Amino acid sequence: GSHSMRYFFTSVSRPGRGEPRFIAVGYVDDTQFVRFDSDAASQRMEPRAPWIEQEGPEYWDGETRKVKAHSQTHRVDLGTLRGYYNQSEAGSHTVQRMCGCDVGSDWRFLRGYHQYAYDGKDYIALKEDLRSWTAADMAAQTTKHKWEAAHVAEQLRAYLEGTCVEWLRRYLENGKETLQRTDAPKTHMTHHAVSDHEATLRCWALSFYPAEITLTWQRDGEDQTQDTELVETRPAGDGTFQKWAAVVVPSGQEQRYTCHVQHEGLPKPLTLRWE
């Protein structure tokens, strides 16, 4: 199937003293593989998956150099943005950046992306054509003109179509034993009376990977959304994910309802029914 490599950066200003907090995390699909935390003692990019540990010192030196350089760019950014928005020196603010590339099931480049936010709102984004930028407001418009003058889209398109995809391919190979394994959801249904007359059925999907999943309830074979609840997909903490969907039904009519589970690890969708 398709794969992605993405990096997420967050920088949080600390007005009263010192430099912003900066946290960077790198993923291949839903697997985190590196982190950098400005507050940690190492001051290095650190591994967070076993398959990245086989990279040599040059790799780690280079990743560390780049990530610290990024943190310093966000540091300058936070100062400029406070000025763009005429904000007090007293408040804490946030910059966030995300970028990455996707490849299809042939491992060829499919798409690339970069988005940047200030205080949790879109600020500037690379368009899908990798050639131009979207700016949300007149501050970002200024940034867009700066980034156009410096030919940033061209350099970023180079990364996204080249080195991003090349290293994603390398990781997929080295980490094949987990990164190319799909863990189908382990599913079951539980039953919870709510009164004499109604009961909740809860359809569980556990220990799956990747995170993308669809759970749907049907009643007598038609999709039902009323009287249902679907929780956000959540991390188990061992690299897999969990989700459930529940429906309230009249007691005795449980057999009319089916839970339908779709996931990349399932050749055909699963159907669960209480009996």
């Binding site: 990530v67 760019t73 950014d77 400029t80 090349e166 290293w167």
Partner: peptide, 10 residues
């Protein structure tokens, strides 16, 4: 493998 630090500050 990160992109290098090629974005100008905003």
């Amino acid at each position: 493998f990160l992109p290098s630090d090629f974005f100008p500050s905003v």
